[PDB]
Enzyme design. Structure first.
Site, PDB file in Angstrom:
ATOM      1  N   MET A  14      -8.474   0.154   5.095  1.00  0.00           N
ATOM      2  CA  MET A  14      -9.243   1.220   4.480  1.00  0.00           C
ATOM      3  C   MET A  14      -9.036   1.137   2.975  1.00  0.00           C
ATOM      4  O   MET A  14      -8.046   1.641   2.453  1.00  0.00           O
ATOM      5  CB  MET A  14      -8.783   2.572   5.026  1.00  0.00           C
ATOM      6  CG  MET A  14      -8.835   2.661   6.549  1.00  0.00           C
ATOM      7  SD  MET A  14     -10.526   2.744   7.164  1.00  0.00           S
ATOM      8  CE  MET A  14     -10.979   4.398   6.658  1.00  0.00           C
ATOM      9  N   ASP A  37      -1.442  16.962  13.495  1.00  0.00           N
ATOM     10  CA  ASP A  37      -1.250  16.983  12.042  1.00  0.00           C
ATOM     11  C   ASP A  37      -2.520  16.603  11.278  1.00  0.00           C
ATOM     12  O   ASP A  37      -2.491  15.778  10.361  1.00  0.00           O
ATOM     13  CB  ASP A  37      -0.034  16.146  11.609  1.00  0.00           C
ATOM     14  CG  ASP A  37       0.435  16.468  10.182  1.00  0.00           C
ATOM     15  OD1 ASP A  37      -0.023  17.468   9.579  1.00  0.00           O
ATOM     16  OD2 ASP A  37       1.266  15.702   9.654  1.00  0.00           O
ATOM     17  N   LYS A  41       1.636  -2.662   8.973  1.00  0.00           N
ATOM     18  CA  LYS A  41       2.806  -1.800   8.891  1.00  0.00           C
ATOM     19  C   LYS A  41       4.047  -2.503   9.437  1.00  0.00           C
ATOM     20  O   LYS A  41       4.014  -3.090  10.520  1.00  0.00           O
ATOM     21  CB  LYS A  41       2.561  -0.470   9.614  1.00  0.00           C
ATOM     22  CG  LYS A  41       3.794   0.438   9.692  1.00  0.00           C
ATOM     23  CD  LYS A  41       3.461   1.894   9.409  1.00  0.00           C
ATOM     24  CE  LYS A  41       2.910   2.604  10.627  1.00  0.00           C
ATOM     25  NZ  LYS A  41       2.702   4.054  10.360  1.00  0.00           N
ATOM     26  N   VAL A  93       7.072   0.137   5.880  1.00  0.00           N
ATOM     27  CA  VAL A  93       6.349  -0.432   4.736  1.00  0.00           C
ATOM     28  C   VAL A  93       4.961  -0.910   5.166  1.00  0.00           C
ATOM     29  O   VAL A  93       4.814  -1.539   6.213  1.00  0.00           O
ATOM     30  CB  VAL A  93       7.138  -1.607   4.082  1.00  0.00           C
ATOM     31  CG1 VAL A  93       6.402  -2.160   2.855  1.00  0.00           C
ATOM     32  CG2 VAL A  93       8.541  -1.166   3.693  1.00  0.00           C
ATOM     33  N   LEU A 128       0.825  -1.203   0.000  1.00  0.00           N
ATOM     34  CA  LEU A 128       0.000   0.000   0.000  1.00  0.00           C
ATOM     35  C   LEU A 128       0.862   1.258   0.000  1.00  0.00           C
ATOM     36  O   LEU A 128       0.434   2.309  -0.475  1.00  0.00           O
ATOM     37  CB  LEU A 128      -0.946   0.002   1.206  1.00  0.00           C
ATOM     38  CG  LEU A 128      -1.910  -1.181   1.372  1.00  0.00           C
ATOM     39  CD1 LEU A 128      -2.676  -1.069   2.682  1.00  0.00           C
ATOM     40  CD2 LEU A 128      -2.873  -1.307   0.192  1.00  0.00           C
ATOM     41  N   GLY A 129       2.075   1.136   0.536  1.00  0.00           N
ATOM     42  CA  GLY A 129       3.029   2.240   0.590  1.00  0.00           C
ATOM     43  C   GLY A 129       4.321   1.840   1.275  1.00  0.00           C
ATOM     44  O   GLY A 129       4.374   0.817   1.960  1.00  0.00           O
ATOM     45  N   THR A 182      -3.790  -2.958  11.733  1.00  0.00           N
ATOM     46  CA  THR A 182      -5.015  -2.168  11.905  1.00  0.00           C
ATOM     47  C   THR A 182      -6.116  -2.613  10.937  1.00  0.00           C
ATOM     48  O   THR A 182      -5.896  -3.481  10.083  1.00  0.00           O
ATOM     49  CB  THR A 182      -4.764  -0.651  11.676  1.00  0.00           C
ATOM     50  OG1 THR A 182      -4.490  -0.415  10.291  1.00  0.00           O
ATOM     51  CG2 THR A 182      -3.612  -0.132  12.522  1.00  0.00           C
ATOM     52  N   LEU A 218       1.397   9.043  15.782  1.00  0.00           N
ATOM     53  CA  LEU A 218       2.735   9.571  15.500  1.00  0.00           C
ATOM     54  C   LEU A 218       3.044  10.801  16.350  1.00  0.00           C
ATOM     55  O   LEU A 218       2.213  11.702  16.486  1.00  0.00           O
ATOM     56  CB  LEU A 218       2.892   9.912  14.014  1.00  0.00           C
ATOM     57  CG  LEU A 218       2.638   8.854  12.935  1.00  0.00           C
ATOM     58  CD1 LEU A 218       2.813   9.494  11.567  1.00  0.00           C
ATOM     59  CD2 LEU A 218       3.552   7.638  13.078  1.00  0.00           C
TER      60      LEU A 218
END
Ligand SMILES: CCN(CC)CCOc1ccc(Nc2ncc3c(n2)N(C)C(=O)N(c2c(Cl)cccc2Cl)C3)cc1
Ligand SMILES: CCN(CC)CCOc1ccc(Nc2ncc3c(n2)N(C)C(=O)N(c2c(Cl)cccc2Cl)C3)cc1
Length: 241
Positions: free
Chosen positions: A77, A119, A37, A22, A18-19, A74, A140
């Site tokens: 989404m 944020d 993650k 990682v 997903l990104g 998690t 975070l």
């Protein structure tokens, strides 16, 4: 140990990235869709520690951790980042106000727990398969989302999250435009100090604009709470739909 939060890594499957630590989409025992993650080690897991104590329907929900092996697991989404969603997927204005409400509910919950996001922005929200928006990356420099008291002397408060939320409403109603699109960060900070404010997006009614604009009062104490903002959004929802 993390008690009920401990997940056997061998129950996870990995389906796609997903990104890139990682992040991958996968399943837990082929039952639940999950996001995973992968990874300093100690500060990586602090995110999960924060998330263990926060739970809301409009907040990305922690499922567990793998720390004996390091993973954070998690809810998944499916529609990815809200900023990409606003720029790439397709809206009637009532769907836009719904997105605002989703975030407002999350932030009202965070407010009730005296927790500061720091944020809040469309980039840090995710969108599920049903189009429900949830606040993410809460475990975070965002100049364009910051009030004057933050920019000038790092005065963070419930009211700096309120300011950012108004900007997020603006992102939603502008379909993912960068706030202050023709200015640099430096120029934005200067203009904010001079009382300049984001314009009303064409898709935003005067009532909707009043709500976002109220978040940008020069005096922090004069900005609403998320509880008030939620009541305002619901009233507009009833009036416009
Ligand atoms: C609080 C604290 C921790 C959790 N953790 C949690 N783990 C797994 C699932 C889940 N929550 N929810 C809400 C589902 O709908 N699941 C789920 C899903 Cl997403 C699909 C099919 C079955 C289930 Cl049990 C799986 C939830 C609330
Ligand atoms: C250009 C991007 N492209 C991909 C190829 C398009 C699709 O991109 C997508 C698709 C789906 C998602 N969905 C998604 N769901 C849950 C989490 C998550 N993403 N990320 C990035 C986290 O860091 N999570 C998270 C958090 Cl917030 C805290 C702790 C652990 C996790 Cl897993 C949870 C996100 C991005």
């Amino acid at each position: 140990g993390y008690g009920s939060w401990e997940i056997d890594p061998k129950d996870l499957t990995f389906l796609k990235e997903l990104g890139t630590g990682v992040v991958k989409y996968g399943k837990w025992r082929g039952q639940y869709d999950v996001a995973i993650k992968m990874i300093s080690e100690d500060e990586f897991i602090e995110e999960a520690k924060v998330m263990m104590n926060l739970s809301h329907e409009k907040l990305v929900q922690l499922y567990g951790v793998c720390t004996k092996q390091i993973f954070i697991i998690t809810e998944y989404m499916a529609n990815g980042c809200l900023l990409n969603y606003l720029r790439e997927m397709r809206f009637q204005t009532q769907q836009l106000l719904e997105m605002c409400k989703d975030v407002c509910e999350a932030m009202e919950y965070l407010e009730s727990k005296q927790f500061l996001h720091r944020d809040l922005a469309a980039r840090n929200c995710l969108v599920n398969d049903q189009g429900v928006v949830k606040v993410s990356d809460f475990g975070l420099f965002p100049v364009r989302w910051s009030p004057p008291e933050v920019l000038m002397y790092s005065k963070f408060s419930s009211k700096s999250d309120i300011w950012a939320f108004g900007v997020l409403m603006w992102e939603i109603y502008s379909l993912g435009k960068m706030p202050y699109e023709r200015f640099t960060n430096s120029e934005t900070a200067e203009h904010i100090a001079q009382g300049l404010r984001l314009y009303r997006p064409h898709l935003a009614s005067e009532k909707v604009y009043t709500i976002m604009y109220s978040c940008w009062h020069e005096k922090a104490d004069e900005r609403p709470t998320f509880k008030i903002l939620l009541s305002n959004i619901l009233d507009v929802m009833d009036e416009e739909s």
